[PDB]
Design a protein around this ligand. Structure first.
Ligand code: HEM
Ligand SMILES: [C-]#N
Length: 147
């Protein structure tokens, strides 16, 4: 899915993205900005809006799971199996009509929140590698969702 160079860039910058809170703050900003920009998504998640307490709670769980996916990146089948299981659980989440179309704008909010945290370290190579990693992580979740 990712080249060895891309996996090494993702693994390296993940230390800076995780910070001291296992990426919790990045998760809150990712989902906050996503729902503010796409207000119709609040109903899909089951939140009142961008300021719902649940946004910060769920943002931390998303980023903690990406941290687990990053630790398994060198074994593709292992990473895919885990995320596929997360995907199967999403059949019963929110409005229970989570669509594949929703994951691409979420990816854009995620990379923006990562950049907001690590600044200049989120350079062109870092953005390409994380766009590739997000494609595979969310692609594996979507396959579980649609299984
Ligand atoms: C726009 C697409 C998405 C929607 C609408 C969505 C929705 C939800 C909802 C509503 C919950 C709360 C479940 C509960 O009440 O317990 C949840 C949990 C979770 N989501 Fe998502 N999600 C999406 C994308 C993602 C992505 C990309 C990841 C990837 C890391 C992810 C990882 C998780 C995790 C780790 C949980 C916690 C529960 C579990 O492990 O299954 N979600 N999601
Ligand atoms: C998913 N939150």
């Amino acid at each position: 899915g990712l080249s060895a160079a891309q996996r090494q860039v993702v693994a390296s910058t993940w230390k800076d993205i995780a910070g001291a809170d296992n990426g919790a703050g990045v998760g809150k900003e990712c989902l906050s900005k996503f729902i503010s920009a796409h207000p119709e998504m609040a109903a899909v998640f089951g939140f009142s809006g961008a300021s719902d307490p649940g946004v910060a709670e769920l943002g931390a769980k998303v980023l903690a799971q990406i941290g687990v996916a990053v630790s398994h990146l060198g074994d593709e089948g292992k990473m895919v199996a885990e995320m596929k299981a997360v995907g199967v659980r999403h059949k019963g989440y929110g409005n229970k009509h989570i669509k594949a179309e929703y994951f691409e704008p979420l990816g854009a909010s995620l990379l923006s929140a990562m950049e907001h945290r690590i600044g200049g370290k989120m350079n062109a190579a870092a953005k390409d590698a994380w766009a590739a990693a997000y494609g595979d992580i969310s692609g594996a979740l979507i396959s579980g969702l649609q299984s």
